[PDB]
Write a protein that binds this ligand. Structure first.
Ligand SMILES: Nc1ncnc2c1ncn2[C@@H]1O[C@H](COP(=O)(O)OP(=O)(O)O)[C@@H](O)[C@H]1O
Ligand SMILES: Nc1ncnc2c1ncn2[C@@H]1O[C@H](COP(=O)(O)OP(=O)(O)O)[C@@H](O)[C@H]1O
Lengths: 53, 53
């Protein structure tokens, strides 16, 4: 009984941990995409911006 | 739902970026052509211009 309720609580902690890491991975990739989008936008702002070389 | 609307906005940004780059490429080539036309015109202005060697 002690091992089963211990293991159950630990399993709950494992599930929570995994869910949070899955979230973090999703958020990390969309930030990479938005960063790359910003970089692309900057290069167009440069070439098609004002005057210069 | 969050991933789909995020991805949709990012896809819109990608489409806009690509359209602007396609435009830039078109404009770049017609400028190369007009530059080369000007250079050709200059060589005729030289040979068939005034006096000299
Ligand atoms: N004569 C110019 N006109 C506009 N931009 C220039 C010029 N010369 C250089 N730049 C470059 O283009 C960028 C224009 O600044 P930015 O804030 O993007 O323009 P805006 O304030 O109109 O959005 C600057 O970072 C600068 O490095
Ligand atoms: N005697 C000359 N008459 C005309 N052009 C000359 C003469 N000697 C040299 N050139 C060259 O030909 C060019 C004539 O100048 P340009 O402004 O093209 O003529 P226009 O003002 O009649 O259009 C000059 O760049 C110059 O280098």
């Amino acid at each position: 009984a002690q091992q089963r309720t211990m293991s159950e609580n630990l399993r709950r902690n494992l599930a929570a941990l995994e869910a949070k890491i899955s979230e973090a991975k999703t958020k990390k990739n969309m930030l990479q995409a938005r960063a790359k989008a910003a970089k692309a936008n900057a290069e167009l702002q440069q070439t098609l911006g004002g005057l210069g070389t």
